[PDB]
């Protein structure tokens, strides 16, 4: 015998989180707070030249925002906890293996439901210990106990995204590697040295030296007619992004499917 | 009853060599689509940067040495 | 939970700013530094 | 039983947007405000020389309108909600394949209707609950229950666009992804750089010094012979909207026709 | 009775792998318009960077070793 | 005879690790301490310009973790040791192979249960002394004495990680290399040197000079338009990974699946 | 009788020769995989930089010499 | 498994340590020693300087620059000669084998 809620089974498909808890998690949760960021521009303070203004929490967390986004489409993941209603269609060559499924957004952290319907009325709906998932792929499975194709036959539920890092060093297959954070956050910091370059001295001004009454100074910038003044960080955060990039496209892989 | 029977070696090339994790998914998606006389005639699809395949065998074998039997 | 939207401007207008001129006074102070490189000579190679 | 109204089924083609709503929502629902773009140039005023003027709200409007449009061609989308009058021919071998129809312009948030006329009369009407769709592909599929060709035989009306993100870091496929409005801020800000890279100094100067009395003012700029003055910061949105660009190809895919 | 029946592997170029969504929706197209008899003679059109198309077994096969079990 | 405990055999699968000790065991065993990053970073303070505050110890921590995790993929390994509850697939080919397993995580420093299960009911729980590892490889392999495929078939639980080495300059093929330190090290101080870089002189200031009364003061530093301050350490430390990561990976070597 | 009945050597190229325990773990996977008539006709993946097989005998052999003989 | 010190001057039997990995390894700590070395000639980051004070004037120019660390001359020798004793060296153990 066993206990469980009736859609989880603990083999297979173990419950991970709360329904009700998704809407909860935010960014704060995954570190991305624009603490974080102004950690990594650890001495460097960003102003307003003309004002003692510097920019507040939330262009930081718009920026964030944007920038997990923009690494969500870098791979092709869901990257936050999220509820999704899918419909997926009758290929006979997958049906007959095992009835396989390739969910559109993953890692899965768990399944709800997986119903076969025909025209919105429930046809047969399987027992919840038959189905199998694989979490990180997101391979949903079927293992029956005791045209050559159709539309949208079968209706999946199903919650997808990951799960904070609850242990130091360390993550589940169903968890967040602690790089996806460092990537949207060097994502957040290409913006921010994008607009930070700008304001060091005036704006367009490469070369000045000033001279009165006897005291005189030159200084430099890094400004130049070829190259901004933050440029040197910002191809320094591409050097490190590609290789952060290519490494982690090798924890999910390649993209396959049948034809 | 040994070995060498081996028909060819398919070849992906990859900044990174994938995790062992993403090659049995990927075995998985080969396997539900393509194996056995179910989805036989289907062609798969992949997106890497380039693909080979060396022939280690030739494309049809037959016994070796007849006519020195003979 | 919602999505960080930049929104409006806050900033009111101001006219006829006066410039900020420094207060005398006998009270001691602290003088705010700057930590950086400092150039100094050779003096052992001004020995040679 | 179930309770809808009757073009809208909630199994295929639930309803997603009200017909009279397309009017009311504006580039402002998206973020698109000019404060956006300022936000961005966080710390630099357009403003010009040579009088205290700074360039209206109603130029920001005018250039995004252009952002949004050029982004709905340079990605083969609708992205404002809007309806479409859609007529199709007839393709045997389509047709033959549950009716499959690739529509013109993408997401299709909803269908309202789907008929088949021979010289303006309606010849047969479908049942709402025979079609169904794929949103964000906008495939239009029929499943009925219980020459070759010919042209503009089908009729079809269909609601494209893509609604507001309701929730961060989040999106549903009939939904606005953040990307896109990333994407087309950075397309205005490429037009704004362009206008104030001319107001930085005088007009095509690039070097000057003046010495009066012993005086000495001496000024550098960006600008240069072979380099404009903000060219430095276009260069860096090109950089950032090839990987931005290329990155969300791979959500909406390659285009196919069969021949 | 076992795997290994695939004809070949037909590659697409591309900047970014796309997502299993779009591969599906582009599954879709191609059986709607190529799979069986329906729209056999047809010619799909694609607008990729290169595209190839690799063999993994012989244009025709036949019985192996047919000398040897005579 | 033969005294062990029942799921750990001397031969094939000898004890490693104590299962409580795995939470004890933490980065500082492994000598990754803020001080070890000080150390190779020998006479550089890196302190804020503006306020006399060095970064603290917190900032290296959280950089270290992000270190180890960022090398656990780019050589794919589990590093630091954790327990595995892991379900893997029936393949007839491998499965006559004296019922050969790959982890999805290596080394393996132990295995505690390998079970055959249908509906989750355990069919068959084989004999510990039966079973045997490869620590290193990860195989699992079993030895029995006295469709062709299925979904989730068995089920797997094992530790995944490396022991701190015990003595100099030799380590186990289960013992922590003592190249992995170094190149954590190394990941570490690239981004600390991407931080510290900024803080030389002002903020991306290139050239200098002061001249009052006839004094004169005057700097050229390593900041330029094209070539960020740290960027010369940046790239010995490339050229330094690079002879580092590529020695490391052939210990490990290639990955192969059969398909 | 004596030796010269190899077939080919199946070359990688890599910045390291891989270390002798990596080589073997590489057999025990290609034996386990792919040895005998078990996976007779599976097809291994490899994600090196580049792989060659260079023949160093002929794809039939046969009696040498025979018109000599006769 | 390991290799014995070399007991003999200039010599070293097929169990005996030859002397160049005692050198290579050095090297490759000098290769460390260096890269830390070559920050501290002249506090951090100054490429050139000049000061002049009361009649008397002072210029230096170190080897740092924006493009090469201080220390990279001798960083780029040492690869050198590792990389001539290392491939060198490879030879007396020469290429690894195994059947399939
Ligand atoms: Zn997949
Ligand atoms: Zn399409
Ligand atoms: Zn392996
Ligand atoms: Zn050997």
Redesign the interface.
Known sequence: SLNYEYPYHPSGNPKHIDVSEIDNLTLADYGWSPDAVKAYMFGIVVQNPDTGQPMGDEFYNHILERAVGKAERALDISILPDTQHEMRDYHETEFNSYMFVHAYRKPILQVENLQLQFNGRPIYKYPANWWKVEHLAGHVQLFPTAATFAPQMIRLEYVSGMLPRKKAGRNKPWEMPPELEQLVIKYALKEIYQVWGNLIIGAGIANKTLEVDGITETIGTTQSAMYGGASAQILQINEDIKELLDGLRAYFGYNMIGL | ????????????????????????????????????????????????????????????????????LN | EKPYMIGANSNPNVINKSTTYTTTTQADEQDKPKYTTRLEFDTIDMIR
């Open positions: 009853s040994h070995g060498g029977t081996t028909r060819g070696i398919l070849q992906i090339r990859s900044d990174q060599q994938q995790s062992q994790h993403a090659l049995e998914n990927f075995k998985r998606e080969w396997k539900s689509s393509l194996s056995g006389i179910n989805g036989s005639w289907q062609i798969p699809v992949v997106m890497a940067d380039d693909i080979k395949f060396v022939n280690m065998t030739p494309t049809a074998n037959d016994m070796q040495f007849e006519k020195w």
